Amino acid sequence: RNQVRFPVLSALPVAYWVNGDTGLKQTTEINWTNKYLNIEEIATIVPVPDNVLA
Amino acid sequence: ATGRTTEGRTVTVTTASNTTITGAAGTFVASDVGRTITRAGIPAGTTITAVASGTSATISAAATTSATSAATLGSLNGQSQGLVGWSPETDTEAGAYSVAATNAGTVTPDRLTNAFTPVSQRGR
Question: What is the superkingdom listed in this entry's lineage (chain B) (predicted)?
Answer without folding.
Answer: Viruses
